[PDB]
Every structure is written in C-alpha cells, then in structure tokens.
Amino acid sequence: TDYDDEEFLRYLWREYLHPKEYAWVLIAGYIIVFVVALIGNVLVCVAVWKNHHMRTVTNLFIVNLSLAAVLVTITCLPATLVVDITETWFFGQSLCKVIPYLQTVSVSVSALTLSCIALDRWYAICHPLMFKSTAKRALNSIVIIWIVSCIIMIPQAIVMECSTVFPKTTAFTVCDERWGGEIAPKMYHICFFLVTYAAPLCLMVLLYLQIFRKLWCRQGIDCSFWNESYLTGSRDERKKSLLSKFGMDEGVTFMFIGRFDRGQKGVDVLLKAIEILSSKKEFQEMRFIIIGKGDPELEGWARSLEEKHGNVKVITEMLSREFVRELYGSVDFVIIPSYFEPFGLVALEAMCLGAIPIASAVGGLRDIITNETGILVKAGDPGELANAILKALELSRSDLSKFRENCKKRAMSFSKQIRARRKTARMLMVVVLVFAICYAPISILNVLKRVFGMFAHTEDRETVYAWFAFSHWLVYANSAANPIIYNFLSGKFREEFKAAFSWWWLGVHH
Ligand SMILES: COc1cc(N2C(=O)N(Cc3c(F)cc(F)cc3F)c3ncccc3S2(=O)=O)cnc1OC
Ligand SMILES: CCCCCCCC/C=C\CCCCCCCC(=O)O
C-alpha cells in the first residue's frame, strides 16, 4: 500500500492552509484563452496553407508564430493552471524539465520571428535595394530560429529540478530552478531578459519607426486633395491662362518646384541645362517656371536668366497648397533633377494631376516613373537633362493626352501600393505593441525576483503570488490575441477566417 503514486491526496491534506477561491476566475480565464488560442492559431495555419495568395514572407513567419503558440497552449497552458492554484507539481521529474524547456523555446522562437518580420519589412521598404525575400529563404530562417532557440534554452532544462520539500509535516513535490551558487542564475536571467524581450523590442522599435516615418509621413500623399476634379476647363485652357499671368504666350511649359540646394534637389543642374538650351532656336518654343528659395548664389543665377530671357520666370515667395495644385494641372512637364530623392512625393503629386515628369533616375523617382509615364535621366548630368527637354518638346507637337492618362494611372497605382504596405505595417506594429504589454509584467517580475532578489522577505505573499499568476495567464493570452488582431486588421485573414468557419460548421463555401 504505497503512497508515492498519490500527490493529490497530500495536496488535500494541505489545501486548508492556502485557499484562494479566485481559482474559478482563473480557471474560467484559462479555459477561454485555451479555446481562443487553439481555434484562432490553427485557423491561421489553415488560412495560409489553403490560399496560395497568402504565402507571403510576412505570413509564413506569422504561421511560425502560431505554430509556437499552439505548442504552448497544448503542453504548457494546462500545467500552469494547476501549478498556480495547487502550488504543487503532479507531472513527474521528466515533465519538470520538458514543459519549462518547451515554453522557453517557444518564447525564444516568438521573439526571433517577430524580429525577422521587422527585419524583412525594413529591408523591403527602407533599404535602397528593396530586397524581395522568397518563401525558401523564409523557411530556412524559420528552421534556424528553432535550432537556435533549442540550443540557447538547453541550460534551462539542465537547471530545472523536481524535489520533495518536507517542511505542516506532510511533504509535497515542487518543480523549480536549482542552480549551483547564487552567481550563475543572476547572470543567466539577465541574458534571458535581453535575448527574449529587451534586445528584440529595441530592434523592432528602431525598424518600425523608420517604416512609419516613410510610409505615413515622407510618402503621405493626400489623394483627397491632389485630385483632378478640383480644376476647371481643359488643360490648354488652364495653361495659356497661367502663362499670360507671367507675361508669356502659348508654349510647352516646364516647371521646377523645390529648394535651391547645393547637392540635393538639383536646381543647379536645371540652371546649367537652360544655358545649354538657350543657344538653340528651340529655346523660344519652351517656357520655364522655376519655383524655389534658398542658396543666394543660385537665386542670383536664376534671376539672371530671368532678366535675360522672356520665357523664364522665377518665383521665390511662399506658395499656397492650392496654387501648386493649379500649376500641376496646367504645365506640360515638371522637372525634378534631384541628386538624392528616396521617396518621390513631388512625382506622385504632379502625375496625379497630369504633369509629365522629367526626373533623375534616383531611388524615389526611378520607382515611380516608368518608360511610358515620363522621362528619366542621369542625376548630375546637365547635358542629359538638356537632351530630355528637347525630346519633351518633340513629343509635345502631338497630343500628350495619352501620356497624361498613363501618369494619373501610375501615380494612383503607386499610391495603392503605399496604402497596402501601410495597412500591413499597422497590423504588425499592433502585434508588437501587444507583445510588449503582455510580456512586460512577467519579464519585469522575473528580473526583480531572480536578479535583484526581491520578494524574498515577504510582507504578504498573496499579492506576490497573485501578480505572478496573473502575469502568467497574460503570456497565453498573447497567443489568444494575435489571431484577433489578424481578423480586425487584415482583410485577407478576415475573409479566410470566415471561409474556414463556414466550411467547418455549414460546409457552405467548400
Ligand atoms: C510553464 O511552466 C513553467 C514556466 C516557468 N518559466 C517561467 O515561468 N518563466 C516566466 C517567463 C518569463 F520570465 C519571461 C518570458 F518572456 C516568458 C516566461 F514564461 C521563465 N522566466 C524566465 C526564464 C524561464 C522561464 S520558464 O521556465 O518559462 C517555470 N516553471 C514552470 O513550471 C514548473
Ligand atoms: C546570449 C546570446 C544568445 C544569442 C541569441 C541571439 C539569436 C540570434 C541568432 C539567430 C536569429 C535567426 C535569424 C535568421 C536570419 C534570417 C534573416 C531574415 O531573413 O530575416
């Protein structure tokens, strides 16, 4: 008649010493999370492996984010519910090593996968080469993440130990970390806080802040304002009216709008090109509007060409938003001879209103301007810009209306891409924020406990064990939350969630 088999009876003989009866609010909260995390995360894998349009690098990682969340929801979640209520280990020495090893590996996989998503997004949106990763490269990085996590969390499995604690007189079994010397655990739990929480979050905040700044602000094209409908009449009716205001008659109009910079916007390239062209009879067919302020030398050069030629006009005063809109929907060509332009907001603004851009083949403008929607040249070459202004005149003897419609369709198509990339970043950023808030209490509490040595001398252990149990539930709640973020913030996931639910209950879609 051996009593080694029964640990639950020994817990009943001690149950009176530490009652809680907030156990029902924790059991209810653990069941709710268990169902939502298991249903939601499996739907994530299914929705990606069903639809081949969904197999993007961002989503393949998101599946590897749900694979680790299903692993803990099954193996680690029920064991945490029992321990945080009974304060006893009922699962034996072998599972005292495996279960905590499975949740440290899962926390490492989750931090490194979220960092690779930010990394992949930054190399695709911010890096000047605009890298386009493949599904093969995303799966090999996924394999490596699991290999790395399984190695770096091996010391945790060695350290866990299941021991019977004798001090009323009825002993009970517990599973905890057991280190030799109080010097190694403080070193390790610093390295755990860094690799799993601190270092990834600082990396992702720095990568997503550059992604937010580019997509929201630097590429923030307001299509509600830069629109064709705000104009009146036909384009040649607006052009000749505009020229007559500056004392010019009809002619192919060229427009520059930008600061007079020494190295950047490139008005010095345009000023050099006008002097090249000024020696030709084709010059008197052209009209130039140079709008800008800045370097005093280039100003004097622009006012010197303005005095000499009657088809050059320089505007140095501050222009209203609607005024630049009137120019874009009037002039024939807009010249952007930039040395450095990583966003090309001027091109999107001008093409949306019909202007045909003659721009440098630099990153922001090279992406937007194609072979059928404008003319590209070398950034620092005034002679190649002079040739392009001659080609724009030759083309302007025919009807340019076909090119204007291509420009409007290309700038709108490019704004759709920005708006699509924006929604994906906003969704990923919420996931990160929710990851930060969910792991914040348990990461801080384990640093204060294991490194700083807090909670050792207790004033009241109820509040400390309550905060510990609450923070532990929040970690599994993060696995419940992410599929809800995908449903609220991604239309591709939302419809695929509805199609998998309709098949599962009704069989109505498939
Ligand atoms: C599920 O069951 C058990 C879990 C644990 N552990 C644990 O509570 N945490 C808390 C924790 C964090 F601090 C940070 C974080 F990002 C995620 C976490 F979950 C650990 N904290 C530091 C190192 C290793 C672990 S841990 O081994 O995962 C211990 N004993 C168990 O059962 C006997
Ligand atoms: C105490 C130090 C422990 C070191 C843990 C740091 C783990 C980082 C190592 C590998 C992370 C895997 C990144 C895979 C590269 C893929 C790049 C990509 O395409 O995003």
PDB file of N, CA and C and ligand atoms in Angstrom, residues 80 89 100 103-104 107 156 160 175 189 192 439 442-443 446 472 476, ligand 1:
ATOM      1  N   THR A  80       0.372  25.101 -16.171  1.00  0.00           N
ATOM      2  CA  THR A  80       0.458  26.354 -15.432  1.00  0.00           C
ATOM      3  C   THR A  80      -0.815  26.626 -14.641  1.00  0.00           C
ATOM      4  N   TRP A  89       3.605  20.106  -8.015  1.00  0.00           N
ATOM      5  CA  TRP A  89       3.952  19.518  -9.305  1.00  0.00           C
ATOM      6  C   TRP A  89       3.470  18.074  -9.327  1.00  0.00           C
ATOM      7  N   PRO A 100       8.939  23.261 -18.973  1.00  0.00           N
ATOM      8  CA  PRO A 100       9.554  24.595 -18.985  1.00  0.00           C
ATOM      9  C   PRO A 100      10.525  24.798 -20.131  1.00  0.00           C
ATOM     10  N   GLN A 103       8.451  25.996 -23.053  1.00  0.00           N
ATOM     11  CA  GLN A 103       7.928  27.379 -23.016  1.00  0.00           C
ATOM     12  C   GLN A 103       9.059  28.386 -23.093  1.00  0.00           C
ATOM     13  N   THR A 104      10.298  27.976 -22.891  1.00  0.00           N
ATOM     14  CA  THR A 104      11.389  28.955 -23.048  1.00  0.00           C
ATOM     15  C   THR A 104      11.774  28.931 -24.520  1.00  0.00           C
ATOM     16  N   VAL A 107       9.131  30.955 -26.256  1.00  0.00           N
ATOM     17  CA  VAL A 107       9.278  32.420 -26.036  1.00  0.00           C
ATOM     18  C   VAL A 107      10.461  32.925 -26.860  1.00  0.00           C
ATOM     19  N   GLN A 156      18.383  25.767 -19.467  1.00  0.00           N
ATOM     20  CA  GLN A 156      17.178  25.851 -18.609  1.00  0.00           C
ATOM     21  C   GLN A 156      16.746  24.431 -18.268  1.00  0.00           C
ATOM     22  N   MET A 160      16.275  22.956 -14.210  1.00  0.00           N
ATOM     23  CA  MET A 160      15.027  22.559 -13.569  1.00  0.00           C
ATOM     24  C   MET A 160      15.211  21.257 -12.802  1.00  0.00           C
ATOM     25  N   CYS A 175       8.517  21.782  -8.541  1.00  0.00           N
ATOM     26  CA  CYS A 175       9.427  21.887  -9.675  1.00  0.00           C
ATOM     27  C   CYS A 175       9.908  23.328  -9.784  1.00  0.00           C
ATOM     28  N   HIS A 189      19.524  34.992 -16.033  1.00  0.00           N
ATOM     29  CA  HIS A 189      18.243  35.675 -16.174  1.00  0.00           C
ATOM     30  C   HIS A 189      18.394  37.104 -16.680  1.00  0.00           C
ATOM     31  N   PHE A 192      18.550  36.141 -20.292  1.00  0.00           N
ATOM     32  CA  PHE A 192      17.214  35.676 -20.747  1.00  0.00           C
ATOM     33  C   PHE A 192      16.363  36.909 -21.045  1.00  0.00           C
ATOM     34  N   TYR A 439       4.163  40.640 -22.230  1.00  0.00           N
ATOM     35  CA  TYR A 439       5.360  40.049 -21.597  1.00  0.00           C
ATOM     36  C   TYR A 439       5.996  41.048 -20.637  1.00  0.00           C
ATOM     37  N   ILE A 442       5.541  39.891 -16.656  1.00  0.00           N
ATOM     38  CA  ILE A 442       6.261  38.651 -16.263  1.00  0.00           C
ATOM     39  C   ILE A 442       7.760  38.781 -16.506  1.00  0.00           C
ATOM     40  N   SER A 443       8.191  39.609 -17.458  1.00  0.00           N
ATOM     41  CA  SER A 443       9.628  39.800 -17.648  1.00  0.00           C
ATOM     42  C   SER A 443      10.217  40.670 -16.547  1.00  0.00           C
ATOM     43  N   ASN A 446      10.318  38.699 -13.171  1.00  0.00           N
ATOM     44  CA  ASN A 446      11.366  37.639 -13.109  1.00  0.00           C
ATOM     45  C   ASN A 446      12.751  38.267 -13.003  1.00  0.00           C
ATOM     46  N   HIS A 472       1.250  35.353 -15.718  1.00  0.00           N
ATOM     47  CA  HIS A 472       1.484  34.049 -16.385  1.00  0.00           C
ATOM     48  C   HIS A 472       0.345  33.754 -17.339  1.00  0.00           C
ATOM     49  N   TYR A 476      -0.185  33.532 -22.205  1.00  0.00           N
ATOM     50  CA  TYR A 476      -1.019  32.662 -23.072  1.00  0.00           C
ATOM     51  C   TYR A 476      -2.128  33.501 -23.694  1.00  0.00           C
TER      52      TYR A 476
HETATM   53  C1  LIG B   1       5.047  26.984 -17.803  1.00  0.00           C
HETATM   54  O1  LIG B   1       5.607  26.306 -16.701  1.00  0.00           O
HETATM   55  C2  LIG B   1       6.714  26.837 -16.098  1.00  0.00           C
HETATM   56  C3  LIG B   1       7.298  28.001 -16.598  1.00  0.00           C
HETATM   57  C4  LIG B   1       8.429  28.530 -15.991  1.00  0.00           C
HETATM   58  N1  LIG B   1       9.070  29.617 -16.571  1.00  0.00           N
HETATM   59  C5  LIG B   1       8.510  30.894 -16.285  1.00  0.00           C
HETATM   60  O2  LIG B   1       7.531  30.969 -15.603  1.00  0.00           O
HETATM   61  N2  LIG B   1       9.150  31.943 -16.804  1.00  0.00           N
HETATM   62  C6  LIG B   1       8.439  33.184 -16.922  1.00  0.00           C
HETATM   63  C7  LIG B   1       8.653  33.881 -18.264  1.00  0.00           C
HETATM   64  C8  LIG B   1       9.483  34.980 -18.295  1.00  0.00           C
HETATM   65  F1  LIG B   1      10.068  35.370 -17.190  1.00  0.00           F
HETATM   66  C9  LIG B   1       9.714  35.693 -19.450  1.00  0.00           C
HETATM   67  C10 LIG B   1       9.108  35.313 -20.621  1.00  0.00           C
HETATM   68  F2  LIG B   1       9.362  36.039 -21.721  1.00  0.00           F
HETATM   69  C11 LIG B   1       8.267  34.202 -20.626  1.00  0.00           C
HETATM   70  C12 LIG B   1       8.031  33.482 -19.457  1.00  0.00           C
HETATM   71  F3  LIG B   1       7.213  32.427 -19.482  1.00  0.00           F
HETATM   72  C13 LIG B   1      10.532  31.983 -17.070  1.00  0.00           C
HETATM   73  N3  LIG B   1      11.196  33.119 -16.881  1.00  0.00           N
HETATM   74  C14 LIG B   1      12.494  33.117 -17.146  1.00  0.00           C
HETATM   75  C15 LIG B   1      13.176  32.012 -17.620  1.00  0.00           C
HETATM   76  C16 LIG B   1      12.478  30.841 -17.828  1.00  0.00           C
HETATM   77  C17 LIG B   1      11.125  30.822 -17.548  1.00  0.00           C
HETATM   78  S1  LIG B   1      10.175  29.404 -17.772  1.00  0.00           S
HETATM   79  O3  LIG B   1      10.918  28.223 -17.464  1.00  0.00           O
HETATM   80  O4  LIG B   1       9.383  29.527 -18.952  1.00  0.00           O
HETATM   81  C18 LIG B   1       8.957  27.858 -14.863  1.00  0.00           C
HETATM   82  N4  LIG B   1       8.409  26.714 -14.352  1.00  0.00           N
HETATM   83  C19 LIG B   1       7.299  26.198 -14.965  1.00  0.00           C
HETATM   84  O5  LIG B   1       6.813  25.030 -14.389  1.00  0.00           O
HETATM   85  C20 LIG B   1       7.385  24.386 -13.276  1.00  0.00           C
END
